[PDB]
Each structure stands twice: as C-alpha cells, then as structure tokens.
Design an enzyme around this catalytic site. Structure first.
Site, PDB file in Angstrom:
ATOM      1  N   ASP A 181       0.803  -1.209   0.000  1.00  0.00           N
ATOM      2  CA  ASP A 181       0.000   0.000   0.000  1.00  0.00           C
ATOM      3  C   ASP A 181       0.842   1.267   0.000  1.00  0.00           C
ATOM      4  O   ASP A 181       1.844   1.351   0.685  1.00  0.00           O
ATOM      5  CB  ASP A 181      -0.903  -0.016   1.231  1.00  0.00           C
ATOM      6  CG  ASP A 181      -1.760   1.214   1.405  1.00  0.00           C
ATOM      7  OD1 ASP A 181      -1.523   1.960   2.384  1.00  0.00           O
ATOM      8  OD2 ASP A 181      -2.669   1.337   0.539  1.00  0.00           O
ATOM      9  N   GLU A 238       1.706  -0.440  -4.897  1.00  0.00           N
ATOM     10  CA  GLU A 238       0.706   0.529  -5.326  1.00  0.00           C
ATOM     11  C   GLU A 238       1.349   1.887  -5.536  1.00  0.00           C
ATOM     12  O   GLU A 238       1.679   2.546  -4.546  1.00  0.00           O
ATOM     13  CB  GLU A 238      -0.455   0.651  -4.340  1.00  0.00           C
ATOM     14  CG  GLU A 238      -1.533   1.607  -4.876  1.00  0.00           C
ATOM     15  CD  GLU A 238      -2.096   2.596  -3.905  1.00  0.00           C
ATOM     16  OE1 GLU A 238      -3.173   3.197  -4.178  1.00  0.00           O
ATOM     17  OE2 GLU A 238      -1.448   2.826  -2.863  1.00  0.00           O
TER      18      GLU A 238
HETATM   19  C1  LIG Z   1      -6.174   6.875  -1.921  1.00  0.00           C
HETATM   20  C2  LIG Z   1      -4.814   7.046  -2.599  1.00  0.00           C
HETATM   21  O1  LIG Z   1      -4.329   8.396  -2.292  1.00  0.00           O
HETATM   22  C3  LIG Z   1      -3.118   8.792  -2.940  1.00  0.00           C
HETATM   23  O2  LIG Z   1      -3.307   8.906  -4.323  1.00  0.00           O
HETATM   24  C4  LIG Z   1      -3.176  10.201  -4.924  1.00  0.00           C
HETATM   25  C5  LIG Z   1      -2.257  10.008  -6.143  1.00  0.00           C
HETATM   26  O3  LIG Z   1      -1.108   9.495  -5.520  1.00  0.00           O
HETATM   27  C6  LIG Z   1      -2.120  11.293  -6.927  1.00  0.00           C
HETATM   28  O4  LIG Z   1      -1.297  11.086  -8.093  1.00  0.00           O
HETATM   29  C7  LIG Z   1      -3.524  11.780  -7.307  1.00  0.00           C
HETATM   30  O5  LIG Z   1      -4.118  10.809  -8.164  1.00  0.00           O
HETATM   31  O6  LIG Z   1      -4.354  11.858  -6.125  1.00  0.00           O
HETATM   32  C8  LIG Z   1      -4.539  10.586  -5.493  1.00  0.00           C
HETATM   33  C9  LIG Z   1      -5.573  10.710  -4.368  1.00  0.00           C
HETATM   34  O7  LIG Z   1      -5.173  11.798  -3.531  1.00  0.00           O
HETATM   35  C10 LIG Z   1      -2.027   7.760  -2.608  1.00  0.00           C
HETATM   36  O8  LIG Z   1      -0.871   7.985  -3.435  1.00  0.00           O
HETATM   37  C11 LIG Z   1      -2.463   6.289  -2.791  1.00  0.00           C
HETATM   38  O9  LIG Z   1      -1.491   5.463  -2.123  1.00  0.00           O
HETATM   39  C12 LIG Z   1      -3.806   5.974  -2.156  1.00  0.00           C
HETATM   40  N1  LIG Z   1      -4.238   4.549  -2.105  1.00  0.00           N
HETATM   41  C13 LIG Z   1      -3.710   3.638  -0.947  1.00  0.00           C
HETATM   42  C14 LIG Z   1      -3.463   4.520   0.302  1.00  0.00           C
HETATM   43  C15 LIG Z   1      -4.282   4.703   1.358  1.00  0.00           C
HETATM   44  C16 LIG Z   1      -3.628   4.882   2.719  1.00  0.00           C
HETATM   45  O10 LIG Z   1      -3.469   3.605   3.323  1.00  0.00           O
HETATM   46  C17 LIG Z   1      -5.763   4.380   1.381  1.00  0.00           C
HETATM   47  O11 LIG Z   1      -6.507   5.617   1.655  1.00  0.00           O
HETATM   48  C18 LIG Z   1      -7.763   5.402   2.208  1.00  0.00           C
HETATM   49  O12 LIG Z   1      -7.700   5.347   3.648  1.00  0.00           O
HETATM   50  C19 LIG Z   1      -7.409   6.611   4.284  1.00  0.00           C
HETATM   51  C20 LIG Z   1      -7.168   6.343   5.743  1.00  0.00           C
HETATM   52  O13 LIG Z   1      -8.282   5.877   6.439  1.00  0.00           O
HETATM   53  C21 LIG Z   1      -8.599   7.505   3.999  1.00  0.00           C
HETATM   54  O14 LIG Z   1      -8.433   8.718   4.747  1.00  0.00           O
HETATM   55  C22 LIG Z   1      -9.329   8.924   5.834  1.00  0.00           C
HETATM   56  O15 LIG Z   1      -8.629   9.116   7.050  1.00  0.00           O
HETATM   57  C23 LIG Z   1      -7.710  10.217   7.121  1.00  0.00           C
HETATM   58  C24 LIG Z   1      -7.030  10.186   8.503  1.00  0.00           C
HETATM   59  C25 LIG Z   1      -8.537  11.496   6.865  1.00  0.00           C
HETATM   60  N2  LIG Z   1      -7.758  12.745   7.029  1.00  0.00           N
HETATM   61  C26 LIG Z   1      -8.295  13.688   8.086  1.00  0.00           C
HETATM   62  C27 LIG Z   1      -7.558  13.318   9.374  1.00  0.00           C
HETATM   63  C28 LIG Z   1      -6.476  13.926   9.899  1.00  0.00           C
HETATM   64  C29 LIG Z   1      -5.980  13.609  11.310  1.00  0.00           C
HETATM   65  O16 LIG Z   1      -6.400  12.319  11.751  1.00  0.00           O
HETATM   66  C30 LIG Z   1      -6.157  15.353   9.377  1.00  0.00           C
HETATM   67  O17 LIG Z   1      -4.803  15.688   9.736  1.00  0.00           O
HETATM   68  C31 LIG Z   1      -6.420  15.342   7.862  1.00  0.00           C
HETATM   69  O18 LIG Z   1      -6.053  16.557   7.224  1.00  0.00           O
HETATM   70  C32 LIG Z   1      -7.914  15.078   7.636  1.00  0.00           C
HETATM   71  O19 LIG Z   1      -8.263  15.219   6.260  1.00  0.00           O
HETATM   72  C33 LIG Z   1      -9.277  11.423   5.521  1.00  0.00           C
HETATM   73  O20 LIG Z   1     -10.128  12.548   5.303  1.00  0.00           O
HETATM   74  C34 LIG Z   1     -10.152  10.190   5.526  1.00  0.00           C
HETATM   75  O21 LIG Z   1     -10.815  10.075   4.263  1.00  0.00           O
HETATM   76  C35 LIG Z   1      -8.613   7.790   2.505  1.00  0.00           C
HETATM   77  O22 LIG Z   1      -9.682   8.663   2.223  1.00  0.00           O
HETATM   78  C36 LIG Z   1      -8.782   6.461   1.775  1.00  0.00           C
HETATM   79  O23 LIG Z   1      -8.642   6.637   0.383  1.00  0.00           O
HETATM   80  C37 LIG Z   1      -6.106   3.707   0.034  1.00  0.00           C
HETATM   81  O24 LIG Z   1      -7.296   2.928   0.169  1.00  0.00           O
HETATM   82  C38 LIG Z   1      -4.926   2.835  -0.439  1.00  0.00           C
HETATM   83  O25 LIG Z   1      -5.224   2.082  -1.632  1.00  0.00           O
HETATM   84 CL   LIG Z   2      -4.097  -1.361  -5.891  1.00  0.00          CL
END
Ligand SMILES: C[C@H]1O[C@H](O[C@H]2[C@H](O)[C@@H](O)[C@@H](O)O[C@@H]2CO)[C@H](O)[C@@H](O)[C@@H]1N[C@H]1C=C(CO)[C@@H](O[C@H]2O[C@H](CO)[C@@H](O[C@H]3O[C@H](C)[C@@H](N[C@H]4C=C(CO)[C@@H](O)[C@H](O)[C@H]4O)[C@H](O)[C@H]3O)[C@H](O)[C@H]2O)[C@H](O)[C@H]1O
Ligand SMILES: [Cl-]
Ligand SMILES: *[C@H]1O[C@H](CO)[C@@H](O[C@H]2O[C@H](CO)[C@@H](O)[C@H](O)[C@H]2O)[C@H](O)[C@H]1O
Ligand SMILES: [Ca+2]
Ligand SMILES: [Cl-]
Ligand SMILES: [Cl-]
Ligand SMILES: [Cl-]
Length: 496
Positions: free
Chosen positions: A197, A233
């Site tokens: 991831d 990823e």
């Molecule tokens: C989801 C992918 O994001 C990134 O992708 C980028 C590309 O890299 C870029 O080129 C362009 O296309 O934009 C894309 C999207 O922005 C990343 O590169 C890629 O790896 C991702 N897929 C992987 C990664 C993750 C992480 O494990 C998964 O993400 C999912 O899970 C997140 C965590 O639960 C989820 O986020 C939720 O929780 C966080 C904490 C929250 N943030 C708030 C909280 C804090 C403090 O606690 C504050 O400080 C923040 O500012 C607040 O916003 C998010 O709002 C909440 O949604 C995320 O949404 C979800 O996608 C993914 O599933 C993997 O496949």
């Molecule tokens: Cl994937």
C-alpha cells in the site's frame, strides 16, 4: 519478486474486498479452486483504529494501530485457517500490507481499536508494536502543515503525512525490522506475497531494505527458494514527478494507466475508439508487461478515491465493465487482478459520491457472511463479479491461452475489434452502434466451439452461442449492438 507464485497455469488474482476470512476459505474450496483462480488479495489483516464518524467506513482498515492479526475480517486463528485451506486447493493469498503509516495523527487516544490495543496518536505511542515518537517522520518533513502540499516534490510525498496519517520513519532499521517481522509472520503462515500500500509514499530504497529481510515462501506449498510476489501501489498516470519505474527493482507495480485509458476507450469518451487498442500495452506508453499488475478498477477508484475518475468502469456499469474485463483477460499484457465488490448507496452531489465511505455489508458493524444463491450469485449485497459467467469464463480463457502470442488482430476502423492468442483462443467485440457481421480469421483449428460469454460447454454441447470454425480457421461472428453482452470468446477447451 515478479513471479506471482500461483499454481502453474493459473493467471489471475481476485480482490475479495472486505471479505471475512472464513468466507474466503469457503470460497476457495467451493469456487476459486475449481474455477482456476490463482489467488486472492485480502484486505489488511492487521489491527486498525475504529472510526465512528462516519460509522465503520471501509477506509478505517488503512489506519493501523498494531500488527496483531485481528480485524473485522477475523482473528489470527481464522486467518491461518483461511491461508491453510486456500493453499490446500491451490489458491494463493496475497496480503494488503499497510506499512507507510499508522493511524490518523488527529485520532483520539484509547482502546477503540479492532483488537482492543491501546494507542495514543497525539503522542505517537503504539505500545502493541511497539512504536514511539522516535519512529515517525515529523522532523524530516519540511512542510508547514506536516502534510503533503505538493505532489511535484518527491521529498514531501515520501516524508510528510498522507491525508494526516502518521508517517513511519522507514529509514530506521528499527522500523524496517518491525515491518519485516510482521510480513515474515504472514509468509510463514503461508501467504504468497503482498500488495504494498501507498508505495509512492515510501522511498524505493526503504522498501528494498524491508524486502531484503523477507523469508522465502513456506515449503509446505511452494518450491524451495521461492520469493514473495511483490506488487507496489504507485499511482502514476504520466503527468507527475514520481514515476512507476522508480520501483521496478523491488517488484511489480500497479499500472493505473491501464484502467483509466481502457475505461475511456470502452466508454467512447474523448474521441477514443476500440480500434485504437491494436497496440495496447507498451504502445500506449505503459510499463513493461513483466513489471505490471493490471486491473480495470480497484477498491479506491471504483468509488472515486485514488485516480482514474469517472472513466473507470465498475460493476455499476455492468455491460461495459464485462467488455473491459474481457479485453483485459484476453490480452497478454500484465498480470491480471479482478475486483470483487459490495454494493453501497451512492449519492452524487455535484459529481461527488458523498457516500464513498460506506463500509462492507454489516449488521451493526459486524460484517455479513457471503451467502451463495442457487444460481451461483451472492446475497447480502456482495456483488461477486468474479462469479459472473462472463468474467469467470474469461479467467479460464486466460489460463487456457497462457504463453500464446497476440495474433490475428482485426478491426472495422471504429469500435469493432477482434484478436486471438496463438492457436488457443479468440475474442470478438462489437462496441459500435450498429451490427457486427463479419467472417474473421480466428487462428483456431476447425471445429465447433462454445462461446464462453453466453454459455458453457456442458459435456457434448454448448448452453449458449456456438461458433463454427472452418478448416481454414475462419468463422462468422454476428453480434448486434443491442446484445446483452456484445462480445464472443472461444478457446481450445470450449471446443466440442
Ligand atoms: C487513496 C490514494 O491516495 C493517494 O493517491 C493520490 C495520487 O497518488 C495522486 O497522483 C492523485 O491521483 O491523487 C490521489 C488521491 O489523492 C495515494 O498515493 C495512494 O497510495 C492511495 N491509495 C492507498 C493509500 C491509502 C492509505 O493507506 C488508502 O486511503 C484510504 O484510507 C485513508 C485512511 O483511512 C482515507 O483517509 C481517511 O482518514 C484520514 C485520517 C482522513 N484525514 C483527516 C484526518 C487527519 C488527522 O487524523 C487530518 O490531519 C487530515 O487533514 C484530515 O483530512 C481522511 O479525510 C479520511 O478520508 C482515505 O480517504 C482512503 O482513500 C487507500 O485505500 C490505499 O489504496
Ligand atoms: Cl491497488
Ligand atoms: C490512439 O492510440 C494512442 C496509442 O497509439 C493512444 O495514445 C497513448 O499512447 C501514448 C504513448 O506515449 C500516450 O502518450 C497517450 O497518453 C496514450 O493514450 C491515444 O490516446 C489513442 O487516441
Ligand atoms: Ca512516507
Ligand atoms: Cl524515515
Ligand atoms: Cl530511494
Ligand atoms: Cl526455502
């Protein structure tokens, strides 16, 4: 790290997104083994924080709090049972490894976690691992907010917080060792490999340092000396600073360009046409086939997270989705992953699904079992695309034609196309708004073949469309633009 380590001859994996371990174990035995699937990508099996606002979203599983194997999918005993049962019928298990980060930096302290471990995110305390403030990258990050402000700066993408998640100090041997210990426990249990991831958010050399610590696969099921399959990823659609190729030394990489471009083509958006797919693969600027993990949709982009946007095809667009998945499973490019999903109540507001957080089917937060209907569909709002005849039979097609070259391309200069795989399979698509009625060279021996999209070979006969191939290898294909499934596929094992 590039070899999938599936049983010989099995050429795809399925993502059983958010499924429980006991259901996967049963699915291996009753379906995936017999139907020739190579393996299963499972949701993160490590303990995560409980998110109550909104109520148990899918994405809480990307917020680790320990490496204990205890989640809404099940506990360690259930996980081991699954891996044992699946390997015993020749279906491998690939783990989604969440190793870049722990939970949200703004999360509350306490034991609101899936196994009851304590954590104190504000103080960077994860005693069940253990990690402390010393094991995170807050100092190394140079942005004022501590988050990623610009994807144009590779330092921030790797050293700052991704959506506020506490970013592990992957330079430190302590941290690398904690991660390796987790991954090695999984390998010894019998897992075949990992989806890494958020690889974009780690330095390639830090990933390498972790991977170099990994055990060989368990010889109860794998040859001696077998290395875990690695697929990283990395979202790189071609216009940002970090390139997929930076990661090729560690294993395969997800090719997100694949589904983005294929979706646009199949939708006939932006002037795109299926006839343009003749040079699909590296001709479209993709990574080398031997480095690619390909897919039409993934768990992020089917619900508007991650990248690809509205062009991504999903089960919600079932007719076109089957065409795209069929094209992918017939074409030799890449190692293929098929998605298996659940339904949720979409609610688009100005183009955004505000219900994109909804977690798997559940009763009050407890994930529902996957029930199987007499017609082989699933209940309880599991979609089970991998059970759709048109996708299962194309998973079998890909195994039948493994090793055979792309051959016998044809197109009508618009959206009718066809190609084969050596002398062992042929596929024909009509994505134009008019009839396909053409006699095409299939490359196959003469005979009568069952169309595996509309039916099956059952003993001596076909339950759907039959294709008569002449002694010269030609056959007529007649596909209306109003057909339920406007594509036909035949292969060596569907011959009568
Ligand atoms: C989801 C992918 O994001 C990134 O992708 C980028 C590309 O890299 C870029 O080129 C362009 O296309 O934009 C894309 C999207 O922005 C990343 O590169 C890629 O790896 C991702 N897929 C992987 C990664 C993750 C992480 O494990 C998964 O993400 C999912 O899970 C997140 C965590 O639960 C989820 O986020 C939720 O929780 C966080 C904490 C929250 N943030 C708030 C909280 C804090 C403090 O606690 C504050 O400080 C923040 O500012 C607040 O916003 C998010 O709002 C909440 O949604 C995320 O949404 C979800 O996608 C993914 O599933 C993997 O496949
Ligand atoms: Cl994937
Ligand atoms: C017509 O075909 C081309 C491939 O021939 C598609 O272009 C793709 O390939 C180039 C290769 O670098 C890449 O730059 C494009 O973004 C990618 O689409 C066209 O989109 C088709 O219209
Ligand atoms: Ca990082
Ligand atoms: Cl670091
Ligand atoms: Cl590096
Ligand atoms: Cl060994």
């Amino acid at each position: 790290q590039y070899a999938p380590q599936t049983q010989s001859g099995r050429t795809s994996i399925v993502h059983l997104f958010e499924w429980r371990w006991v259901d996967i174990a049963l699915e291996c035995e009753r379906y995936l083994g017999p139907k020739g699937f190579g393996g299963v990508q499972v949701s993160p099996p490590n303990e995560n924080i409980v998110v109550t606002n909104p109520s148990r979203p899918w994405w809480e599983r990307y917020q680790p709090v320990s490496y204990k194997l205890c989640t809404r999918s099940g506990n360690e005993n259930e996980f081991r049972d699954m891996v044992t049962r699946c390997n015993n019928v020749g279906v491998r298990i690939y783990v989604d490894a969440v190793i870049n980060h722990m939970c949200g930096s703004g999360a509350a302290a306490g034991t609101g976690t899936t196994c009851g471990s304590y954590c104190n995110p504000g103080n960077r305390e994860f005693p069940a691992v253990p990690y402390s403030a010393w094991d995170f990258n807050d100092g190394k990050c140079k942005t004022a907010s501590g988050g990623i402000e610009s994807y144009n700066d590779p330092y921030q993408v790797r050293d700052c917080q991704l959506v506020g998640l506490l970013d592990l100090a992957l330079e430190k041997d302590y941290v690398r060792s904690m991660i390796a210990d987790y991954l090695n426990k999984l390998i010894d249990i019998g897992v075949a490999g990992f989806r890494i991831d958020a690889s974009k958010h780690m330095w390639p050399g830090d990933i390498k340092a972790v991977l170099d610590k990994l055990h060989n696969l368990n010889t109860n099921w794998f040859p001696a000396g077998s290395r875990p399959f690695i697929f990283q990823e990395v979202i790189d659609l071609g216009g940002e600073a970090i390139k997929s190729s930076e990661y090729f030394g560690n294993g395969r990489v997800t090719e997100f360009k694949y589904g983005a471009k294929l979706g646009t083509v199949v939708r006939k958006w932006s002037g795109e046409k299926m006839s343009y797919l003749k040079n699909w693969g590296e001709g479209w600027g993709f990574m080398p086939s031997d480095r690619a993990l390909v897919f039409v949709d993934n768990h992020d982009n089917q619900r508007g997270h991650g990248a690809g946007g509205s062009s991504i095809l999903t089960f919600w667009d079932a007719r076109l989705y089957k065409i795209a998945v069929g094209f992918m499973l017939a074409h030799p490019y890449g190692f293929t992953r098929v998605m298996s999903s659940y339904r949720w109540a979409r609610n688009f507001v100005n183009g955004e699904d505000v219900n994109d957080w909804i977690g798997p089917p559940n009763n009050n937060g407890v994930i529902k079992e996957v029930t199987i209907n007499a017609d082989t569909t699933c209940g309880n709002d599991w979609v089970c695309e991998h059970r759709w005849r048109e996708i299962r039979n194309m998973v079998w097609f890909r195994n039948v034609v493994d090793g055979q070259p792309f051959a016998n391309w044809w197109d009508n200069g618009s959206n009718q196309v066809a190609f084969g795989r050596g002398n062992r399979g042929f596929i024909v698509f009509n994505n134009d708004d008019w009839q396909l009625s053409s006699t095409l060279q299939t490359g196959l021996p003469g005979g009568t073949y069952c169309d595996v999209i509309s039916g099956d070979k059952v003993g001596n006969s076909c339950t759907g469309i039959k294709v008569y191939v002449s002694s010269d290898g030609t056959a007529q294909f007649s596909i209306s633009n109003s057909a339920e499934d406007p594509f036909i596929a035949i292969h060596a094992e569907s011959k009568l």
